[PDB]
């Protein structure tokens, strides 16, 4: 059992997708509240996922907590009452509009969380049991592919009401019998979710622990990360089976100050470093996906990043991955010791600049980028350890 | 360039090998400072003033 | 050739100056990291004292007394106090030793890290195909200083067992309170009755020990560390030069 | 052309040396530690 | 006292595998030594090339490795 | 012989127990140490 | 031997610290220099200061004697005993 | 052979006991030569 724990939005799900070279989980900020993920091996003809939905009781509990925080004047029977559900949904929408966006403020994030919780409870009411947790498979839920189920869970409301997700797929990493368990962010708003994650990591069944650390992007350590590290060190059973990963290392490739801060921090705290790793899950995963594309699809813009490239006014929004690839070629300098001679044009769009760079250079640049990401090193190290 | 020389055509790959050796060694990643050398290399090749 | 000799002499002078500057920066307190480590040391020591004393149990002291005297299954009620004193002193000494190890290793690692950047030490490898003896002497001094500091801590901590007059204050706790338990109240050889007096002896140990630890930590350890460093490193730097 | 351009290589080397120093020290330590052990079976068995 | 009395019996019982254990240990040590030796030669070639590059135009010498014994 | 030696050992160990006759103040108080301690015993030597 | 010499050096350096017994006015005030300075010491030669030698000698006596007496009579015996008993015993166990 | 092993163990125990006895004799002050040396130490220090 390999359990990934860390701060919310630390990239645990994205890091897992990078290890699997697959977009299985959802990297949604402000939406992954208490959703525990399990990955297990399965034959190519036995790829399957099992979805456990939050019971009506759990939904009512989190809805009550969110309403209490949001200071909405309603009763405790709102989730069952249609009109009360509509009232609370409109109240949350008004809060979000006043705050200017779901991700703009903490109150906005929690209001949107409650809104999507109620919407999912209404949508998935038939699949939600009053007390017990309801479990279903693709055949039960009429899902034709793992991608379709991943999209269904990617939706904000479905993730809001989904409790546990157990996917099964064919991967050499899982062949040995390794189970990848992604846990809710330790700093998640729900104290119960954080407690569940802490109990899981403390669980004896946890064979290995992977701690995803934000300082690579934050420049310092969060209080929740420090608390998790202290608890890990205190727990004798798991303190000798813990590996640390610094995700979002790309931010320090061009920012020298954050970089020196990271280096000083790592030298100061972690005396041993055979279990520490630095990686860029986003870049590694996206490069792995782009390796499967060709010019007919603009190297994935029309296929992989079609959802993220469609702007509201018809202009092609630059994918985060395209922006970070251009930044990697321009300022990171990790290309600065290779045979490639990339050149970023300021008179061109980010997407078109990307198109030109990979048209001139091809897949070898993507392979060098993935090597810079360093996912393979961490994967091989953990595999050798196991 | 007046001082353009042939010897350091492959200086690129030598530096690459050094950084690769540093990355390969797990314990030595505590001292990892490869990217200062990278920036100095970048201003070494195709220099700009 | 003579210019090379001049350069070597200047290199030696520069190394001596750098080492003196670093040690004196530590002494004055300008080394912020060392100040952080030392305040952590003091806070840990005070917290350990408070926690250990407030968690003291008479039964543990009696168990220690029984262990100390194998050929008897019973220990006199007075042995509780003696074993309490010895246990307190021993645990405090162990904490001192471990924290000293931590501090010394961290300081030496920081010094080594910041020493491998200056041109003075950088220039050695240019004209010589090795490092000379800097690392060897540094490690030797590390071991010597660690041994000296642990000896200092052990020697200073053993004085705590000595009964200070604050341990004899009658108004807080008289030692004769055992007789009331003995006179038919303790119907047996079991020390369960003595458990009633635990809070008073806890307060007495607080009164006796707190001044000792406060005085030692706040007065001596800083000066001891500064003196050991300044008296060990300087001759080593001269020998290296 | 003359003063600045060589300087870039100089600062590059100066910034490069530390990691090479660390690599050399670590490899030499490992080699000497490994060579410390005996090689003959007759003497090796005594340790066990 | 008794358990440590019969050390001879334990050694007689372990002599059947002592030889194999020693041979395996020697092989492991030699393998690791040769591995780090190969790494050292690669590093030495890299540093030699670097120094030759900068020698043509400037005076500097990065650390080489020789007679590690 | 074994039974009698066990009897003797078991009966003799009770002597260590502090009887009240060991606590008679009029003969010897235990606090007499403090007079030696208060600057009379100028050292850690138990000669006093 | 190394431990004991370190002990002695560390303990002896505290003597330089000015104890209040070094500041007793009634025995010797530090301002006595001004009388020599005010035209009495017609030059930069310190010959005039020689007059104050006995008072400073007595002041140093007062300051130092308690320090040395306390240290020698209190600490050194215990330090030696502790060093011996804590160094030899583990060595004897390793020898056994 | 077993008697030889017994003898070695007894030898180790005896050596430990002797060293402890000597050190504790010094500690108690029963070592007259050590007391002479220490009083010489103190007298020399005071005289100096």
Numbering used by the authors:
A (entry chain H): 50 to 435
B (entry chain A): 1 to 49
C (entry chain E): 484 to 724
D (entry chain A): 436 to 483
E (entry chain A): 725 to 793
F (entry chain F): 629 to 676
G (entry chain D): 629 to 724
H (entry chain D): 484 to 531
Could you share sentences copied from the article?
Unlike small (Ras-like) GTPases, DLPs are large mechanochemical GTPases with a molecular mass >60 kDa that use the energy gained via GTP hydrolysis for membrane binding and/or remodeling. While DLP family members are typically not highly conserved on the sequence level, with the exception of the GTPase domain (GD), the resolved structures reveal a conserved modular arrangement of all DLPs: The globular GD at the protein’s N-terminus is typically followed by an α-helical bundle signaling element (BSE) or neck domain that connects the GD to an α-helical stalk or trunk domain. Recently, a BDLP has also been identified in the genome of the cyanobacterium Synechocystis sp. PCC 6803 (SynDLP). Taken together, the recently predicted cyanobacterial DLP of Synechocystis sp. PCC 6803 (SynDLP) is a bona fide member of the dynamin superfamily as classified by activity and structure.
